[PDB]
Amino acid sequence: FKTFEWPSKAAGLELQNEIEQFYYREAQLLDHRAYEAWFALLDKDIHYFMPLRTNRMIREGELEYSGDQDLAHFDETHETMYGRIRKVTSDVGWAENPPSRTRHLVSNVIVKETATPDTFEVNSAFILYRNRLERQVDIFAGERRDVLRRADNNLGFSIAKRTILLDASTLLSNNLSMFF
Amino acid sequence: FKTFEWPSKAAGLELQNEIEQFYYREAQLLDHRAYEAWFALLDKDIHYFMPLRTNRMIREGELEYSGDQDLAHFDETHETMYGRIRKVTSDVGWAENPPSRTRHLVSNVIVKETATPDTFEVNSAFILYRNRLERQVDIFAGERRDVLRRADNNLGFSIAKRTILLDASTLLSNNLSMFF
Amino acid sequence: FKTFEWPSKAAGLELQNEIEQFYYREAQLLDHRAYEAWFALLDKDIHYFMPLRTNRMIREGELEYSGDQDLAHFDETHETMYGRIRKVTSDVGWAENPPSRTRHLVSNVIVKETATPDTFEVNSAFILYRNRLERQVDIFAGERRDVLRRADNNLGFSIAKRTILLDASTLLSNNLSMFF
Amino acid sequence: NWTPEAIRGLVDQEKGLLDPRIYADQSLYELELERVFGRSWLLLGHESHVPETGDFLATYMGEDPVVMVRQKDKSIKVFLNQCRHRGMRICRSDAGNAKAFTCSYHGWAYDIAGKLVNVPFEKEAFFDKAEWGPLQARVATYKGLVFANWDVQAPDLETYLGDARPYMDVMLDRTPAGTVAIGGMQKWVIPCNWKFAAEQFCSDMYHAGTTTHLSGILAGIPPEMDLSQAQIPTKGNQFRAAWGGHGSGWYVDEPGSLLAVMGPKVTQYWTEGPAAELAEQRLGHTGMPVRRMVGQHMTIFPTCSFLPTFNNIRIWHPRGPNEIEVWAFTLVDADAPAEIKEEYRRHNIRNFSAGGVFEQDDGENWVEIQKGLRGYKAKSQPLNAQMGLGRSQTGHPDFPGNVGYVYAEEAARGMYHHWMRMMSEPSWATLKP
Amino acid sequence: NWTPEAIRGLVDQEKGLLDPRIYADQSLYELELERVFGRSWLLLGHESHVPETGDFLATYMGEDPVVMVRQKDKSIKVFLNQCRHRGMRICRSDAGNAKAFTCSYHGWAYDIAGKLVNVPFEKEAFFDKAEWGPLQARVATYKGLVFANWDVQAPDLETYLGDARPYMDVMLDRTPAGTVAIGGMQKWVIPCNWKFAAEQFCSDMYHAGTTTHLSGILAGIPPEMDLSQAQIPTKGNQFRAAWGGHGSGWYVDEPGSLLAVMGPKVTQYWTEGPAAELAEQRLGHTGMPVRRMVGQHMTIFPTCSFLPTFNNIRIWHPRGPNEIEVWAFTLVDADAPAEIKEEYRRHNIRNFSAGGVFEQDDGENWVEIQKGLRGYKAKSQPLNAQMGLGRSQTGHPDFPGNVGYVYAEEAARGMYHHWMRMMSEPSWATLKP
Amino acid sequence: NWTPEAIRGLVDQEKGLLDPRIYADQSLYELELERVFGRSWLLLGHESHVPETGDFLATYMGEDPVVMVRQKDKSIKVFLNQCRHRGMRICRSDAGNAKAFTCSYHGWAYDIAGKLVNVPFEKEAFFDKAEWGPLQARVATYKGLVFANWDVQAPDLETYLGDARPYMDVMLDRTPAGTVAIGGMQKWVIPCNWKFAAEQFCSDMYHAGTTTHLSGILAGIPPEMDLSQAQIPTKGNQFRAAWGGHGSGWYVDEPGSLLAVMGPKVTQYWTEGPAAELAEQRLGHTGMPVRRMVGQHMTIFPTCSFLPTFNNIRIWHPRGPNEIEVWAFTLVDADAPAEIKEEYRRHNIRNFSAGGVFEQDDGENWVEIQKGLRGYKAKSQPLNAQMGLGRSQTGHPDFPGNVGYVYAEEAARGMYHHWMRMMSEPSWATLKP
Numbered sequence A, B, C: 001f002k003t004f005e006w007p008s009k010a011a012g013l014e015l016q017n018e019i020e021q022f023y024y025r026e027a028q029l030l031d032h033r034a035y036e037a038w039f040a041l042l043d044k045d046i047h048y049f050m051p052l053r054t055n056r057m058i059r060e061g062e063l064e065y066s067g068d069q070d071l072a073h074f075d076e077t078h079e080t081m082y083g084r085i086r087k088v089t090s091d092v093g094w095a096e097n098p099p100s101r102t103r104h105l106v107s108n109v110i111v112k113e114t115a116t117p118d119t120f121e122v123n124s125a126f127i128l129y130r131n132r133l134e135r136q137v138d139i140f141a142g143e144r145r146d147v148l149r150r151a152d153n154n155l156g157f158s159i160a161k162r163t164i165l166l167d168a169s170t171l172l173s174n175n176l177s178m179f180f
Numbered sequence D, E, F: 001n002w003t004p005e006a007i008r009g010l011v012d013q014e015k016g017l018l019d020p021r022i023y024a025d026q027s028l029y030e031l032e033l034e035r036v037f038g039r040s041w042l043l044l045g046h047e048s049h050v051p052e053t054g055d056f057l058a059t060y061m062g063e064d065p066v067v068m069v070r071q072k073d074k075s076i077k078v079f080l081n082q083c084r085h086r087g088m089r090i091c092r093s094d095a096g097n098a099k100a101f102t103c104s105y106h107g108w109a110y111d112i113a114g115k116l117v118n119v120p121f122e123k124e125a126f127f128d129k130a131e132w133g134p135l136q137a138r139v140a141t142y143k144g145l146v147f148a149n150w151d152v153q154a155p156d157l158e159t160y161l162g163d164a165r166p167y168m169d170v171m172l173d174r175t176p177a178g179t180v181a182i183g184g185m186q187k188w189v190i191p192c193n194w195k196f197a198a199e200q201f202c203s204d205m206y207h208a209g210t211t212t213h214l215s216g217i218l219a220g221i222p223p224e225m226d227l228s229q230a231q232i233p234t235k236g237n238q239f240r241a242a243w244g245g246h247g248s249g250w251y252v253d254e255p256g257s258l259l260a261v262m263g264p265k266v267t268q269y270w271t272e273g274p275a276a277e278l279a280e281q282r283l284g285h286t287g288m289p290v291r292r293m294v295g296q297h298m299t300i301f302p303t304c305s306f307l308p309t310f311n312n313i314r315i316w317h318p319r320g321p322n323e324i325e326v327w328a329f330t331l332v333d334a335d336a337p338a339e340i341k342e343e344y345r346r347h348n349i350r351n352f353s354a355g356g357v358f359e360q361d362d363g364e365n366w367v368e369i370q371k372g373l374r375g376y377k378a379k380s381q382p383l384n385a386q387m388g389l390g391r392s393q394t395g396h397p398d399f400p401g402n403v404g405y406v407y408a409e410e411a412a413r414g415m416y417h418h419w420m421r422m423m424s425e426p427s428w429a430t431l432k433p
């Protein structure tokens, strides 16, 4: 995917604060299982994407990530996400009933303004800490590359696009029952 | 505990920075074992709380946390916290002599102005990394719900209330010889 | 090492954001294996230091870290750092070919101004997630104490001095093939 | 292989010697699950945990997950938390209320008694449902506390406890109202053998009265008082069960030890007033001065430990020879003043939780012991269990049974001797009292 | 040591009983690597994973690392990913193209065929290079799928597969062009025995037709529907292989169930139109009505599993008795419309990736089963495998081989019986079909 | 359980064959702790790690924790870091100064000799303190280095080392003023078997003269030139110890290889001027051209390894068959100039640290080898130790003992043969030199 393209003219302090506070609020919604609230942040043209990552020699490093027509961990539209919210808020959704306990620690927020005013490309790092049942702990880490629009909702922003670059090849977790 | 009720009007950049800095300063006191300096931040009316978490079915989700008249991991006043500082600084306090090596990574800071001026309800996320003796590593993750007051000390603030919501049911560590 | 001597007056909001963004850009270079771009950030008078930490009784806490004339995990100069860059970018550098997958989550940024204009002493905390091959996961936590300089370069700053205080005695990891 | 002869040589109570291999050996551990945990009375909690019909608590018996659930007939049932179809956990939450139990795998349904009542597509695909419910356990209550045992050939709970009952009654039988459990159950993990934890509450006051808990006491004593004051208690006794490997120790006539751990308000409650006077009357058939008895510890073999004066109670779950899980909770007299219920609550959290000023140091000890026992030479010579050897007698005026001095390892030798018998002797025909 | 008598008693096909120790025992696992994985036909992937000369794929056979690499002559060789000098891994990336392979330790150089062609300082310090190349495996292809086997004595793939081939062809033989593998191979770790995973795709439709996948169904059906409005499929059949422990299960005339998992376009493609009619004409030699066969699951013993109707294919890699790795990829007809290939890709991610709306629930069940088996009593009583006992016959008008009802365990009983035979019989003279 | 016959058939030094099961078998490891580590001389550090009375270092002998401690009479005593009471670690810090040692559990006090001097409540509850102190070990010093052995029957350090001593003297006996240790000791964890690491330093120069350290050499050469300016060393020798399985290897007349690793200032110190001329005078009685010997590697069997030319030294701590800990430190000549000490320090960090340009790649190979050995087939065929077979002899003008070419496995064959001997022969009556 190559190093994120931060502008030399950094985003204003007012703008830097808004995006961070948006991610802090977002993580709060997810960590407290307010899934309907979080889902309302996703735009109708949302593309939710987490590609596979592989072990390659440096000379073939451009094959590290899976592509548009390869399999992925997530490759979701607004419609497919809606079914997942229905499953995760369902009594018969065994993988999250009883639900897990997660923590999204968000940092390393870099903001880029796009050709379209009030639309921003955002880079952020994270650790997702998942704890399930008695003693299960899966620790995920990675970066998120978002496209965010200024929106007239409770958080002041909506998610237009999300790519999650996870720092794993083989997944050490048995499932991805959580949202990134 | 539900999603933290952040204000629609977000705290100004000056205040956001001041609170973030305070926590960074506090984490520097704890990770460098400045226990007497840390304890000086606590108000006489402090409540230092960390409830138990249990695995409940969605239908019984309101029973996830232990209450005010139940057991907890921590439920401390100024008097009892003083006893803990006396132990942790002791040459015969074996659990922290030799001392552990901790790291408090603080992020996700959400500031809420209260009805009292210069008193703030602050939500924050953390990973506490703890390393003991030869090869022991305990990784804690959770959130903190604090009530902070402006104070006349080297850090700028005082701690009036602290609730730690730890992302664990069964604790995977042998003890909690660290402060949160 | 004792608590970081933070200034009484905190750094301005512009400066706090400049240093933070420098580290977010720096972590982007490392996490995307831009070792050539990262090396260009180091001034020629760089001391890249990472002492050993030992378990000591409270009565002997002044002997925790190793000294100037002891062994270290890293004790590097510009000349020696370049050799390391030459090894990691090498196709015949086995320990990093295939490369690892690193994540530097950076927070706790405290900025101190020195007696030299445009030169700053900065404290920061981190969690370095390292994932290698199929199943290898190494989690590092620690503290960075840097002397940074205003620079007419890409990231806005250059590195004059770095001490990395790692929260470990025995490394649980088989090597330190990554940069901090 | 482990012959009965080889097992007998691991514990020598006459000489006061213990083979360190008992805390580390993997094949010895597998036999403990069968010969010890497979036929002993294991504590699961308190009656008030499951006060109404359908109330359940997910817990463990050894490494076997079990459901403890209250019935329509006001009894408590304990069945194996495993569906006999393909192994799935029937009860998937810690605690709550159930009308039925359904398996998430193939939909096999159970009533709260553990009987299999419905199998999906039974008419089409199928065998009798009465024989395919999860394995049941014998359940018996002792004044609030609920115990379980798989072995139908093992002696009943009352017999199993024997002359240990009086010392339990110190905590359990103080009022006609009974004891109630305080909400919440602390769970944490220690990388150590269960026998270390069981022995310490069985026989070991020597650790609390010497070095382990100096900082725990420092945290308890008034801010104006430094450690060089605090008076180390010496007066005291120790009980070894006639049969079963149970044990208990206590300080006599030293309220200052209770003062440091539980505060002034609890010390008053335990020693002075109508409530303390009533308890001594009720325990009159034992003849014990319970108002003089403080700082008590006790273990019911194998893994039921508690601290009667402090109302702290704990179950040890084995997780291999090198690990345990500590499940802790606390009791209070049902009719006790609200202030007294609160003081017992605060001080148990402060002292004996995962982050407690006492428990921290207990865990620190056990972690390093298990680390050391990984070595060859560290398992090559016996450990000294010679304390108070031949110093006990069964004719004490105040305390009934085999009684010695507070700092002794007589109860320990009893705990290990019984353990040794459990492992070497196949049949209850020679094992029972 | 396990005697052949003790092995035979672990699985009872006549009574429909399974000893649960087969999922947990370490000694039985070591034997599984020798007697099961060391001489079985194991899937490594597809021919299209390695199209060009020098293309490779690093994968596993049991816990043995292997290199699948396409040769100059268009054949495929499979050799142990280990240097016979001191054991270093020869091929150190997952996939790509290679001109040669070289050991990073001492530079022992190998060609793409897996032959040792260069030893540094050979003339100065040495032994024949032709003899010291890594161990080679037998490679066989079935309609695009690539299988491998160590044993020179084992039957060939076609013989090993037997009367299960018809049911494989439902996925693999639909078009003259053949199947191609969509790029990317998902990998995730589940802490559970491989036999649970193998059986579920072999015989277990029961779990999907009852409770496990109620929420997965909820995810697929339109926003207007609630779960109670979704018809539960009941009609169908189960296949048990004549030999090998292979098995498949499918629904008959149940288009609604395919609609929920794979969507309107795939359901149209599979049942109606030119491509659906061409598949039925090609599979007419079996007599099966493929356009009516939906929701199919299948297992090729030991660790090869697929969902033929969904085109989802997966390999289970054993990692001790308490762990597997799941390596999953998907297929499409090479000449299928791009719109259909994309729909197949989408819903395979949506339902069957590690974060799939079906998969999440599968591993959730398996984790607790393996957890439960840590206990002594959890392994004291046999598991029930009595479903559909004595109900299957070989004279079904539509489907070839031993055919019963869809919710049965005749396939499972066949799997564990072959497992038993594999573990108890050293010679292929008794085992061969 | 292993019969002597089965052990002997794991190492064939005649054919040059190794059974790969020696690196992976759990049962063999448990025997190693008893038969190899329980009676071999193991390096604990340097005399200058504990220079003052009461100075200590906490280290390991196998998986047994021990305490190095300097006494009043200037001798070093080594004892088990375990209290005989209940197994608690006596010394709880990595290093420092002690006036005594106290157990944290029950307060058993020990002086700096490991003698039990105080037992709390002894008069009241107790047994002879002189018999209950921790287990003592035989301590012996070779020119600065501190070794320990449990076995009273085992040969003395000198006889144990034998004809390996001249090769140790290259690093140690260069000054009358002796060596000192640079402060600090690096501890890291590699998931491989100890025999891989110990063999490499014993017999494997082959890896440094081929592929392993291509990037390490690249790090050591000037910025303007690459590996095409780096010449491969092909001149040198290897030594196999008469008894003990010790071994060394080195380059002769190859000053370029020292320069790339240790820089110009060390190269000149090692090869020219007063200190190098003094070393040549002192070491002349061995006949060796010490000034021309570079890149030396050495293993004192079992787990004491060093690189004499670089002054790097390490102990391998076994942690199961599949894990070790590496404890590394560095020496200098006590009277060597400050600039020379600094260069030895700097370059040891750059090269042989956990993150060293050389070390990284060494450990990388070992990790992947151990992973492979989880497989059945990966252990089914023997490994090749056939390098330099029958080419060594005891007739060499310059170097004493059984000497061959630098790229050879004669020392490796000697190491494993001795390992095999110690594992299969129970009595020192047959094992003694």
Ligand code: FES
Residues within 6 Å of the ligand: D083, D084, D085, D086, D087, D088, D103, D104, D105, D106, D107, D108
């Ligand atoms: S496991 Fe099959 S229904 Fe319970």
Ligand code: FES
Residues within 6 Å of the ligand: E083, E084, E085, E086, E087, E088, E103, E104, E105, E106, E107, E108
């Ligand atoms: S391991 Fe020695 S060259 Fe492959």
Ligand code: FES
Residues within 6 Å of the ligand: F083, F084, F085, F086, F087, F088, F103, F104, F105, F106, F107, F108
């Ligand atoms: S363990 Fe050392 S004093 Fe009891």
Ligand SMILES: [Fe+2]
Residues within 6 Å of the ligand: D207, D208, D212, D213, D358, D362
């Ligand atoms: Fe204690």
Ligand SMILES: [Fe+2]
Residues within 6 Å of the ligand: E207, E208, E212, E213, E358, E362
């Ligand atoms: Fe399923």
Ligand SMILES: [Fe+2]
Residues within 6 Å of the ligand: F207, F208, F212, F213, F358, F362
């Ligand atoms: Fe090397």
